[PDB]
Amino acid sequence: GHMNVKLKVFHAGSLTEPMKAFKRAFEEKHPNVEVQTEAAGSAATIRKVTELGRKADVIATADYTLIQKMMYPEFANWTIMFAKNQIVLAYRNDSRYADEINSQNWYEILKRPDVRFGFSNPNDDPCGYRSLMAIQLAELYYNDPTIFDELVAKNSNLRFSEDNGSYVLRMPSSERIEINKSKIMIRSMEMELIHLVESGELDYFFIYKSVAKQHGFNFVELPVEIDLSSPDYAELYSKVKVVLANGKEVTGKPIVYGITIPKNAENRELAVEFVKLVISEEGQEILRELGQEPLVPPRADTAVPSLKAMVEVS
Ligand SMILES: [Mg+2]
Secondary structure (H helix, E strand, C coil), X not given: CCCCEEEEEEEEHHHHHHHXXXXXXXXXXXXXXXXXXXXXXXXXXXXXXXXCCCCCCEEEECCHHHHHHHHCCCCCCCCXXXXXXXXXXXXXXXXXXXXXXXXXXXXXXXXXXXXXXXXXXXXXXXXXXXXXXXXXXXXHXXXXXXXXXXXXXXXXXXXXXXECCEEEEECCCHHHCCECCCCEEEECCHHHHHHHHHHCCCCEXXXXXXXXXXXXXXXXXXXXXXXXXXXXXXXXXXXXXXXCCCCCEEECCCCEEEEECCCXXXXXXXXXXXXXXXXXXXHHHHHHHCCCCEEEEEEECCCCXXXXXXXXXX
């Protein structure tokens, strides 16, 4: 009825567990509000608003730059950066060769003919393009120009080209992506790969550390030089770029999650309260307890007057 407001929050798949907690905490404070959450790869999440005509009160992505590139200026005009993450290679203890995989031999294990691994669709999900970025960055770190070629390029139509030191991969439209089903499985968002690994259909998958921990997967920590986790290695990460099918270019960057309130939000006031919760100490702790490092203090890409005291604007 008129005493039941719905706050619509569309978010990155990797924010699924944190969102359950944000929803419970928010509703405890606003008993007449139902926070309606929907998970999808961040680019697909944004398209709900930018292309499908749906209205959301809060948009949260796993890569703040997608809000900037896809929503400015028609659907948003500021982004608050509130969390970080790290790419790891996760598996079950009964995954093929789980007993021998480690940080030094991970890519050789993935190269074995019977090993199947997964990553999400780069056109829809930052985890997917970040997975390809990490594998290509591995070529530079291990001084082995064939890691990406053997694992991905020979098992799909996804290929990195070199251009004066940097590498660029141009994505085919999603409908034209080709994958060798004997070696790789892809899904729109990384969260959808979870059940494939649990069923044994996949042995390994590229995924955020927080999600691996939340779902009880073991994992190989990859070099900081390739895992997109540290602000301090931005210069190395920037050597790889992926051009998404929608034409937007994403560059390897330290993983930083963004949140915004779309310009056309139906319940802006409540949305402000929700964003405040996410970047408050309570919200930072919710993330930490779920295995995801919060960005403390939160930052914004531009002034955000209705939230000035909560954010650092450079
Ligand atoms: Mg190569």
